[PDB]
Amino acid sequence: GSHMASMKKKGSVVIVGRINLSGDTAYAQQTRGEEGCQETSQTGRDKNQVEGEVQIVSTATQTFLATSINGVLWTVYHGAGTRTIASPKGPVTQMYTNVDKDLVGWQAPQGSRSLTPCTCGSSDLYLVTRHADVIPVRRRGDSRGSLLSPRPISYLKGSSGGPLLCPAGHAVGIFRAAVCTRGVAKAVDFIPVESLETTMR
Ligand SMILES: CC(C)(C)[C@@H]1NC(=O)O[C@@H]2CCC[C@H]2OC/C=C/C(F)(F)c2nc3ccccc3nc2O[C@@H]2C[C@@H](C(=O)N[C@]3(C(=O)NS(=O)(=O)C4(C)CC4)C[C@H]3C(F)F)N(C2)C1=O
Ligand SMILES: [Cl-]
Numbered sequence: 001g002s003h004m005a006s007m008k009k010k011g012s013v014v015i016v017g018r019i020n021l022s023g024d025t026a027y028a029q030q031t032r033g034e035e036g037c038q039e040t041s042q043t044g045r046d047k048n049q050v051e052g053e054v055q056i057v058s059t060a061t062q063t064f065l066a067t068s069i070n071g072v073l074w075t076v077y078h079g080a081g082t083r084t085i086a087s088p089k090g091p092v093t094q095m096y097t098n099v100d101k102d103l104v105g106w107q108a109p110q111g112s113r114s115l116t117p118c119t120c121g122s123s124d125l126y127l128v129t130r131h132a133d134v135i136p137v138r139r140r141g142d143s144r145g146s147l148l149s150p151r152p153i154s155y156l157k158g159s160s161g162g163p164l165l166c167p168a169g170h171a172v173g174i175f176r177a178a179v180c181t182r183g184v185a186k187a188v189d190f191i192p193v194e195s196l197e198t199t200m201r
């Protein structure tokens, strides 16, 4: 048995900032503080203006990234679970949910700009972190990319759901996991944009 009247309800994912890539410089902006975030998570009502392609998102327990591609705001399942995302009209239910791919997706919020899938097949990739780092990545497989310079896994923590981009800024994939050997990250694993387009069809 269970006491249903006391049964808690998980809050919504909340947009708390963005990675600005419109100008010549990449920098992160915070659009909502902790206090406002928690109330927005429980209300599901977020009246703030949304801009850009790469959002910073947070639950009450985790913070990560979400990327807009082909009208869908994508993130990772292990960060968002099955949660709604806050919006001006209230909590918005997931349009896509695939745990096998560690992928979820919502309707892209009004005011967001979607990235266009990459069609160049370039090996030179670039990972956008939550700190607005643009890290070069050499593509090694369908869902793998090698870090030109190995880093502590710390620097990539909280960047799942962020994008791997082509040289033209086209979306190549969604950062999902890291190839870690005892604390260091040598490569990254990502959801290919073609796997996104497969899920959408
Ligand atoms: C050792 C390690 C590096 C921690 C781990 N490596 C690893 O497993 O590599 C193997 C070998 C090559 C690919 C991968 O195959 C297994 C697939 C794992 C997965 F990703 F598909 C995943 N599916 C889930 C589905 C349902 C429920 C939970 C799931 N949990 C998963 O993975 C978990 C989480 C994921 C993670 O940390 N992602 C990142 C991140 O920043 N998250 S986050 O924003 O801070 C946060 C937790 C708030 C949301 C980008 C990496 C950053 F830190 F660099 N993990 C563990 C790892 O990366
Ligand atoms: Cl996949």
Ligand SMILES: [Zn+2]
Binding pocket: 118, 119, 120, 121, 122, 166, 167, 168, 169, 170
């Ligand atoms: Zn490209």
